[PDB]
Amino acid sequence: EILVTELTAQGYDPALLNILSGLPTCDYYNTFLLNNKNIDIGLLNKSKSSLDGKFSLFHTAVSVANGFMHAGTTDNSFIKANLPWLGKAQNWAKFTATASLGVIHKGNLLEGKKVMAPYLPGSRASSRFIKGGSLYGLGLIYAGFGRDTTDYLKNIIVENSGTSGDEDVDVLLHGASLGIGLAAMGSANIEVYEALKEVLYNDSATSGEAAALGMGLCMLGTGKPEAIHDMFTYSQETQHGNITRGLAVGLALINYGRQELADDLITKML
Amino acid sequence: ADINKNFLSVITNKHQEGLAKFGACVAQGIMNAGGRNVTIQLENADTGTLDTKSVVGLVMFSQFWYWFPLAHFLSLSFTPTTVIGIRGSDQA
Amino acid sequence: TGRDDTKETVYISSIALLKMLKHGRAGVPMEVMGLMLGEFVDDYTVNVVDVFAMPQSGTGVSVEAVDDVFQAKMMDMLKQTGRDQMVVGWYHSHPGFGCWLSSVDVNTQKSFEQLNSRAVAVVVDPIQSVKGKVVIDAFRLIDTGALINNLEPRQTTSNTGLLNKANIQALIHGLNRHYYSLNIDYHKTAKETKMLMNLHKEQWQSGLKMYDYEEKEESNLAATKSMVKIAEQYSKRIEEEKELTEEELKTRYVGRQDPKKHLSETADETLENNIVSVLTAGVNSVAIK
């Protein structure tokens, strides 16, 4: 981030600056996967028949393996073929299925916002699980180059950080908060910190977990004393079980690579 | 091969708990991941220095019991291994 | 759909568990009843703060044995002191059966579920807490129409997948297939942990409390005598026991019922006690006078 701007002020070819942005190397990984795409199909068939779609645990197990299997190459053939088995999904298993898409279409950044569009809010109302898990998969697709994706999700967060008591709003906000952690990962955006800080203070039933984790993703290894102190106290303040876990983990994220600087926090938590 | 085969024995069996089956289906998909093109790298062989991204994926994955969607963070540790020779006069 | 839709993990406070047990134990053998008072936060976190019992009946637990008078009035008592919250459910006791809802209590849970759909029923066994382990389990109905709609995997979503069982064939049918179980954990602060851990004001001053020496001479005498007899046992064991196949030898020449292990155990046990007895006497003589 720092190096490219100095080369811009010094004067240098745009060919070098295009490499140092990192776009060329993402495209080349996509080409490699396409050429060498070899997927053994009997693994999916065997798993599909035994791990039924009706049971939540069974369906998720297959979804996580399937997205890894199809990571980086658009493969929606399994989705088309086993649509009834997919239709057995429900509550958070259906959210997982939508989030599988952002693994499958990972990379391919030109089409990455144009392949989740049918599922992104304002084009789906059948279930709130699909509206929420499309934003979570968006962050996956653009993870590491999501500076423009951050902007999309920040707007969704600030809107839905004032209410989280409704069912639709709650599921919607959860995927947005995970998405923007990936999209702003290693950028330390103080705009993103603000937006997720309000979700945390909202005392959301399920989105407080994602807010805490996302903040540590965005603020990775900065170890700002305001953030630490604010988060350390808020686990005491809140009584929800999911949030208290999420802040415990997030304090580790934001103090990544702090060796002796984070020593004091370590002592308190133990 | 034996360890591969063991996973499949559980995926077939329908007399073990779903917990064992959950772990078997996933473990097999991890072995064959990316269409059998990607591998886990922790320290690059490019310079012999730790990767920042790697650590983040893995620690998030460890929380999957508590909340299942967190499984997907493992993808941050899957990285393709190939040698791409590029003609360095037009970047072809 | 739109929520977590899973049964609360019931966190029973330090006060509550004891109170239910004292309440139930007195009434053994007859069935006991009462309400749990608590508060409902997350979609699956109910902290049960306190309890109060609903008086006894001559027909035991019934839907009839609920009396609105007792319930509301006792509530109004707490109201004046500001320690009432809201009814999160109820407890009752089957000491003649294992943990599972009898035919009656399911219909009682139905009524309770109407009023508040987080209503739990907790079955207490005051008669299997004469162990070192307290037998206690929590259930909440899953409706019959709900089983037809096949919403049962909805209630196990986002859990560790760890559930509890109680005996097989009749108990276990009702358990998994008509209601839903979630584990129970125990909630406490560091103020309460200190209250329980404390003991007498001469329990941290009980090492100066030597014993009568007649008793300590009893201890010296008994140990030395007994070890002569287990030593004799040990002599016979090591005469043979040197052919092949260890387990065989151990069966033949008493090596099972191991005197080698028993002898060492007794010696160590009496050895530790006598170093402190000597230490106690050496202190008290020199320290006081």
UniProtKB/Swiss-Prot annotation, chain A:
Gene Ontology molecular function: enzyme regulator activity; ubiquitin protein ligase binding
Disulfide linkage: none
Modifications made to the protein after synthesis: N-acetylated by NAT1.
GO biological process terms on file: proteasome assembly; proteasome-mediated ubiquitin-dependent protein catabolic process; regulation of protein catabolic process; ubiquitin-dependent protein catabolic process
Repeat positions for PC: 96-129, 133-170, 175-209, 210-244, 246-270
Keywords on record: Acetylation, Phosphoprotein, Proteasome, Repeat
GO cellular component, one term: proteasome storage granule
Function comment: Acts as a regulatory subunit of the 26S proteasome which is involved in the ATP-dependent degradation of ubiquitinated proteins.
Record note on quaternary structure: Interacts with UBR1.
Miscellaneous comment: Present with 4750 molecules/cell in log phase SD medium.
Family indicated by similarity: Belongs to the proteasome subunit S1 family.
Entry protein name: 26S proteasome regulatory subunit RPN2
Residue span relative to the full protein: 271 to 540 of 945
